[PDB]
Motif scaffolding. Structure first.
Motif, PDB file in Angstrom:
ATOM      1  N   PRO A   1      50.896  -0.999  17.176  1.00  0.00           N
ATOM      2  CA  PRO A   1      49.602  -0.851  17.857  1.00  0.00           C
ATOM      3  C   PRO A   1      48.451  -0.714  16.871  1.00  0.00           C
ATOM      4  CG  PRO A   1      51.260   0.576  18.845  1.00  0.00           C
ATOM      5  CD  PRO A   1      51.866   0.028  17.593  1.00  0.00           C
ATOM      6  N   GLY A   2      47.320  -1.327  17.215  1.00  0.00           N
ATOM      7  CA  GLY A   2      46.176  -1.363  16.336  1.00  0.00           C
ATOM      8  C   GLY A   2      46.258  -2.400  15.238  1.00  0.00           C
ATOM      9  N   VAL A   3      47.336  -3.176  15.183  1.00  0.00           N
ATOM     10  CA  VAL A   3      47.523  -4.197  14.161  1.00  0.00           C
ATOM     11  C   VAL A   3      47.479  -5.557  14.840  1.00  0.00           C
ATOM     12  CG1 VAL A   3      48.957  -5.026  12.279  1.00  0.00           C
ATOM     13  CG2 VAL A   3      48.933  -2.589  12.851  1.00  0.00           C
ATOM     14  N   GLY A   4      46.463  -6.351  14.503  1.00  0.00           N
ATOM     15  CA  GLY A   4      46.325  -7.694  15.015  1.00  0.00           C
ATOM     16  C   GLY A   4      46.745  -8.736  13.998  1.00  0.00           C
ATOM     17  N   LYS A   5      46.408  -9.991  14.309  1.00  0.00           N
ATOM     18  CA  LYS A   5      46.789 -11.081  13.416  1.00  0.00           C
ATOM     19  C   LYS A   5      46.051 -10.979  12.082  1.00  0.00           C
ATOM     20  CE  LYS A   5      45.101 -14.951  13.091  1.00  0.00           C
ATOM     21  NZ  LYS A   5      44.117 -14.394  12.132  1.00  0.00           N
ATOM     22  N   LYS A   6      44.717 -10.820  12.117  1.00  0.00           N
ATOM     23  CA  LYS A   6      43.916 -10.909  10.898  1.00  0.00           C
ATOM     24  C   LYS A   6      44.309  -9.840   9.894  1.00  0.00           C
ATOM     25  CE  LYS A   6      40.162 -10.625  13.309  1.00  0.00           C
ATOM     26  NZ  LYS A   6      40.754 -10.827  14.660  1.00  0.00           N
ATOM     27  N   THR A   7      44.538  -8.617  10.376  1.00  0.00           N
ATOM     28  CA  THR A   7      45.092  -7.566   9.529  1.00  0.00           C
ATOM     29  C   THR A   7      46.435  -7.979   8.938  1.00  0.00           C
ATOM     30  OG1 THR A   7      46.162  -6.509  11.415  1.00  0.00           O
ATOM     31  CG2 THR A   7      43.888  -5.869  10.919  1.00  0.00           C
ATOM     32  N   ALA A   8      47.235  -8.741   9.692  1.00  0.00           N
ATOM     33  CA  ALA A   8      48.550  -9.128   9.193  1.00  0.00           C
ATOM     34  C   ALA A   8      48.447 -10.110   8.032  1.00  0.00           C
ATOM     35  CB  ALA A   8      49.420  -9.701  10.314  1.00  0.00           C
ATOM     36  N   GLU A   9      47.616 -11.162   8.146  1.00  0.00           N
ATOM     37  CA  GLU A   9      47.522 -12.022   6.961  1.00  0.00           C
ATOM     38  C   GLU A   9      46.770 -11.333   5.826  1.00  0.00           C
ATOM     39  OE1 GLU A   9      46.049 -13.025   9.709  1.00  0.00           O
ATOM     40  OE2 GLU A   9      44.063 -13.872   9.404  1.00  0.00           O
ATOM     41  N   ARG A  10      45.883 -10.375   6.124  1.00  0.00           N
ATOM     42  CA  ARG A  10      45.309  -9.601   5.024  1.00  0.00           C
ATOM     43  C   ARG A  10      46.372  -8.817   4.268  1.00  0.00           C
ATOM     44  NH1 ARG A  10      42.716 -12.529   5.381  1.00  0.00           N
ATOM     45  NH2 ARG A  10      43.326 -12.770   3.191  1.00  0.00           N
ATOM     46  N   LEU A  11      47.267  -8.135   4.985  1.00  0.00           N
ATOM     47  CA  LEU A  11      48.347  -7.417   4.314  1.00  0.00           C
ATOM     48  C   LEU A  11      49.221  -8.375   3.515  1.00  0.00           C
ATOM     49  CD1 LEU A  11      49.342  -4.896   7.133  1.00  0.00           C
ATOM     50  CD2 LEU A  11      48.028  -4.430   5.052  1.00  0.00           C
TER      51      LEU A  11
END
Lengths: 184, 185, 135, 135, 183, 135, 135, 183
Positions: B114-124
């Motif tokens: 929760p609170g984690v979307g796609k854009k945060t995922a490719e940033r990580l």
DNA sequence: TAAATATAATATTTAATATTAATTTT
DNA sequence: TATTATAATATTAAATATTATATTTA
DNA sequence: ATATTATAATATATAATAATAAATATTTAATATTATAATA
């Protein structure tokens, strides 16, 4: 960053405190209601604290309960409310009194507190009405829905029929009759 | 300033904590994953706290062991990552899970938190593959080929590095696209 | 705000360091020369600590002695250089050879110390020409 | 925010001091008048200190008495006086001497303090005239 | 603030340019690509501009095109991009080619730009991927409504309607010419 | 933000000026050398200006040449150099004399410039020896 | 930045003013003395104005004579003097009248100015007496 | 610093504009109503511009009337109001009904403005009641309900109802003339 | 003895508004 | 065997006005 | 005369897309330094 201290009251004076913790005495300011509950100088006291962090100077503000410190954090998170304003607030009234006055939208009880004007009451009510609601679709409609389901209506159609008209102050048998007479 | 606190858990109120050391309690917030292994109230605990200095407030962020401590400080060192983001990441899943997913480059495991979307995922993914995670803690023919691959389900990156790996020079499209299709296998 | 620390060695993870004092551990930054002077993990050892404060964080600097700490303060009082070039300098050499080198006005010995070129070497020389005594 | 500090004197170095309060020794600077009342190194000494918080530093100033700390707070509250001007005022003269001379509106007893000119003396007296109706 | 300048060129010291607009010169830099479009000393020029306000400085940036200003502004809104990086990028390559490379998300054509790391290239490409858009008369409205009834989107219909036929033509022939297109 | 200002001299109060450019007359600070190159009041004249921006004030520093503006920019780009310091620098003596002095490491002539000590002069020498790099 | 402004009056809503200088209308505040020294609306009028620069806003302070603006800047340079206070002061009293009141230690004339305490009045006295040596 | 600009409209893209005031063009963001009352591109106009300054940016927000500018001023003077909220509320509606609803203590009028929550509008009431010291029918909804129950889609039925309402005629006849639209 | 000049040391928020007490008139 | 442009990295960051008062030089 | 069940419709659980509001995060510019690839 700090929640509570177990220390020794090295010195009390209005309205601050000195809590000698292992030789270290912290300047802790407390409201008068807390000050009344405090024992004498040299007694271990239970203060649940929060630090106000400002660039030039900090403020240590402790409380006898977690609830007081939490509500103070809520009051300091407000837009135009400073810390010592809220300190005057719970110096004037208690947590149950303030909560009930907010839920009753009371102003006259709280305007006796010094520093509180009409706009102070306005801002405190407008913030605390919706910041907290509970402080530490009907049985007749459900019976009507079940009765109309037994009568042959679909549950969705029964829900739409019972929500079509706002039946108030009427029995379960008669509300079905007035809803069924309503649209027709 | 703070690394470790040989003290007792004075209070346990999720997600916060009060950790008593010689009578001194601290407002400490830890992930839920830590909260699973945290013992009872008053028990002397092992928890590596972290201070974050702001102009308006300070908070303490405890960790069971050094590995997630280093993970947290390096994640917060990113330009886009705040404290609650890494707190949610550690609450959702463990360090080994995230490193083995990042080296596998799957965003699906990241985004269910929760609170984690796609854009945060490719940033990580990108900003961790940017050197931190080795250790455990065109011509007309090529443009025609790329457009044909886009029209046939290919995302542009796999249509791009396939062209880059085996470029076609002064010969017709059908054969280097054919060996590129053999190339991507 | 803080001048000295006296506690037991919680762990050894250089170049960082944790000193468990009254059960409370402090992150301190330590020179390599002091790393040669540290006792075993779990030994009660006195560290003479200095704090630097910036807008988003702070770093402590546990030192085994005074005059190294005041020379740290005098160096970091310069606007052209920060704490970590000082860390490289103090890991390079100790107090007395640095004192004679700046008194001899030599950039070459400062060149071999890592992370330091030439221009910052005469920065150290020029700025510390007339600050301190010979002790 | 430490309102009172009670530890053992770790070392003595003018004008500062290090008070090892159960392992932690704070960088504390006190006026010379308190240094006359300061015991030797290793003695449990109680100081009514106050922290001064800056954007890049934090300073502790201990006081053997509560009222001298209060006067320090009044002095630093003045718009042009920082910590070290108040330090000079505390080191030079005694608190009751200050209040009598302010009631006397004296200036010569203030200017004779080193680092103090006519400007700071006339300032402190005229912005301090309004206070001290309570005592 | 500053959105566009229409002034007279005073001196050329690349990349720093001075633009005397009614007696007062303006410190503005232009890319070397724009150096290939500047006029001579003393000649008036119209530059699309946008300022940057720093803590201790104000910097003025002026381009030949408004769209170049918008792309520059969106580059500056990125968390890891400074003005020096954006000027290096646009001094390497021009605007719509960079747009198509952003569609391509390829690092090879952008690494060759001096002073640019590969890690910068992929992070800017990933955070700049295509979320933006790609770069009436009686007969006009009649054609728009007719193609709406035929299923064409109003924006899709309007660009085919207003492009090829002229102004105030016969509705039948201009609808014919609007529907002449294929994909 | 303004590198050139072709205006008309409205007011002459040295070392400040007012250039009424199309009814708008800004404060213009010039050195005494530029004051010798300055014409009389009401004479249209072009000054090559520089901006300094800090959190509470903005000032205009208009010069007779590009190279004057660029040198002033690179001196204020130093760490320990203020605006009035470099103002006294080019007010004391000419630019190419300064270039010759720093290429010859002449601290003595730079000392005779008022407001400049030996330390500041040798700072200027050492941080400007290689920055010019013979253009 | 701005020292003088020559433009046409567009509106006169006290204390605010706008001056259309070639299509650019700058919002500016002047004292009521300047308001009665103003001509009508639509005429080109020259003012000796000053900008106050800070992090959130920028306000202009026009004066019909340059000495008013200079004394404004000198007052605002003091810590306890603000622009609203100073504009109230020069609205209440004439500049030369203020100078004579300073030289004659006339406290009551500053006291009768609304919103001005006797304390602030004697501050104005004591800093202006040694701030200006009678022009 | 700045209150008024009198130049020529060099460019106008919503919600901004470019007013070339004596050779210098400014990007000024103006409300929807202002854009409605602006002249064409290239026509001179005088605008009541308000100075907006941030530590790292500066803006302008111009108006055709001064009272708009002062009301914007006291709106921004509130801590809880940003520039986008004020711009949205003044773009959506006119100021006279705003001050009357402040006097009438009306919320749902303000809520229908996009981006406005019930708390935001109710706060605006709370501070504006102290800030200000001196300074369709039943058949319309009946036709919509009848068309919805008949089978018509809810928003196009309301479009037909509001295209030619029965303000001066009966509900059956306005339904009769509303069914003209979709044929 | 009277400043000159670095030299060093020391110091460095503001508007803007809401409350309240004393005064003033009816 | 030096020598130089390029790039990645890793630091460091940004105060200046105003007095008090030393030697110093008359 | 009861079911039954072999073919005929059917209505929604499960895929998807489109605002939206609470909750955050909030710094790059300049410059040495050190590799580093290529080079008289």
């Amino acid at each position: 960053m700090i929640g509570r201290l177990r220390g020794t009251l090295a010195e009390k004076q209005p309205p601050h405190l000195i809590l000698d913790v292992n030789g270290v005495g912290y300047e802790v300011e407390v409201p008068m209601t807390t000050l009344y509950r405090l024992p004498s100088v040299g007694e271990p006291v239970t203060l649940h604290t929060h630090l106000v962090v400002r660039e030039d100077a900090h403020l240590l503000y402790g409380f006898a309960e977690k609830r007081e410190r939490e509500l103070f954090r809520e009051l300091i998170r407000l837009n135009g409310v400073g810390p010592k304003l809220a300190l005057a607030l719970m110096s004037g009234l208690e947590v149950d009194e303030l909560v009930r006055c907010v839920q009753a939208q009371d102003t006259s009880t709280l305007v006796k507190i010094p520093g509180v004007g009409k706009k102070t009451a306005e801002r405190l009510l407008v913030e605390l009405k919706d910041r907290f609601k509970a402080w530490e679709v009907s049985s007749a409609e459900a019976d009507a829905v079940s009765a109309l389901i037994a009568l042959g209506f679909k549950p969705q159609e029964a829900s739409r029929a019972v929500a079509a008209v706002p039946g108030e102050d009427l029995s379960s048998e008669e509300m079905i009759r007035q809803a069924l007479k309503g649209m027709v």
